[PDB]
Amino acid sequence: XXXXXXXXXXXXXXXXXXXXXXXXXXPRLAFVGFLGYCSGLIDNAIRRRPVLLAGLHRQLLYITSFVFVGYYLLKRQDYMYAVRDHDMFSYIKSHXXXXXXXXXXXXXXXXXXX
Template sequence: MPGKAVGGLKGAAVRVGTVVARSGCPPGAVRGCWTVGSHPLSLNCRPGRVLGDRREMGLLPDRAKALPPPGIVNRNSVWLGLIGWTTAVLQNGLNRRPALKAGVHRQLLFVTVGWFLGYYLTKVENYKTAKLDQEMMEYIRQHPEKKTYAEILEDFHPIH
């Protein structure tokens, strides 16, 4: 089956079901790559996107599953849960109902939704941080530290 050309990839032909990679990403490249199956994915090549597959949907690619899960109680979950509860209480107050006693089920629902969103945002934050850390470590590995002048020049001993 001949490859279908993918928009945005100049001169590259990719078949449906294969990993999308830019023309500049050589096959078998290890530099800055995570591997999915037998296909290396360069961090510059929209990682995790597979044509004809549902893994390209959502905020987190499949590679994020390799990270440890965040704690159930974290700052994003607490803050967004508190914002959800405050929203329910303010809605009660604006509708001239008892703020804390009316609609307790809605308050619990808003807290739960806020807590879930905070947990998911923490996962996204952890993934992006890990991705940046990997890119930085790969850059450091590719660009070894050059010698400083102190290492090149001889020690200075003044004449007395």
């Protein structure tokens, strides 16, 4: 859902629903953490400094900033996908007539030659 109906408008993270549990040491977090390290490699390409890998130790600021913002950004990702599924399952339960079930068949299909 795009427009809020049950969720509170303008939230820092969620706060209305907190129970979901965020991912711990996820493969998704590692890629954002890799980009934080990658940003601390190409910064020495702009301002000409000796060695991209073994240069200035202000790289720790670049890794942490990508992790801290990324953790909050992925927390919203797990939240928004949950609400999207929650409203989907509630739509089937309340209406029932919109959904139809079919199982087990013996229907003929056209066979291809050559």
